[PDB]
From a paper:
Three different crystal forms of [name] are available, which lead to the structures of 14 crystallographically independent [name] monomers forming 7 independent dimers. In particular, among the two loops that show higher RMSD values in the X-ray ensemble, loop S3-S4 (Gly48-Lys54) is involved in lattice contacts in all structures. It is unlikely, however, that crystal lattice interactions have a major influence on the conformation of this rather extended loop given that all conformations observed seem to belong to a single family, with only two individual conformations (form I chain D and form II chain A) deviating somewhat from the canonical conformation. Finally, loop S1-S2 (Leu12-Ser18) adopts the same conformation in all monomers independent of its involvement in the crystal environment. Most noticeable is the loop region Leu12-Ser18 (S1-S2), which adopts essentially one single conformation within the X-ray ensemble but is highly variable within the NMR ensemble. Variation of the main chain B-factors closely follows the per residue pair-wise RMSD values. There is however one notable exception: in chain B of crystal form I, elevated B-factors are also observed for residues Ala10-Val23. This is the only indication in our set of crystallographic data that hints toward flexibility of this loop, which in the NMR data behaves as the most dynamic part of the molecule if the termini are excluded. The importance of dynamics in loop Leu12-Ser18 can in the X-ray ensemble only be inferred from one out of 14 monomers (form I chain B), where this loop shows elevated B-factors. Not surprisingly, in this monomer, the loop is not involved in lattice contacts.
Author numbering:
A (entry chain B): 0 to 49, 53 to 62, 65 to 113
B (entry chain A): 0 to 114
Amino acid sequence: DPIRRGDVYLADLSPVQGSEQGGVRPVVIIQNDTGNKYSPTVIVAAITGRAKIPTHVEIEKYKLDKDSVILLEQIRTLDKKRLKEKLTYLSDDKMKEVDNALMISLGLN
Amino acid sequence: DPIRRGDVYLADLSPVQGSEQGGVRPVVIIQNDTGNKYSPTVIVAAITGRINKAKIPTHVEIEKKKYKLDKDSVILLEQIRTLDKKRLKEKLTYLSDDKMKEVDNALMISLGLNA
């Protein structure tokens, strides 16, 4: 498996345009778990290889090829078919950080 | 002129896959205005023609009369994405403060946030 918020998957994000984050990489699920259970789509934030940016969350400890960063300014809705290997899932504390970054990114406060 | 949260732009979402919303269509800007000013990208939510009355927590309806829209429409806060600004075409309108509050609420729900 069931897809859950906080899970990290591999996903082919290509193709992309301009300054969009592309290439088959890791992403973290940020959609609520009702949508994750039933809907054909999920919402994710891009993760990339590694400053102090309010919309960025660092992740060391997570089965990752390198020290990475979650980009909360880089988010999108993907068909579940795009999801490949499940890698890990983030701690409750790290998800609190993601939640904070996401609020700032989307001007939610 | 500047791109502002709550603005509605016509935008090119193609190409996409499966149930991802594609096509050239209205989107609403949901990124904060610091990003909208300085960043090469914006984050938006897709808007589609209202195909049926339905009470969906992640959906927010828009009045065709109230705004400059071809049809009665609905904002899909489960269909969002980060777009290079070059994908934005014409600025169509912008949403009221009250309508934007509904959007923020639908967005909190969609993204499993609560406050």
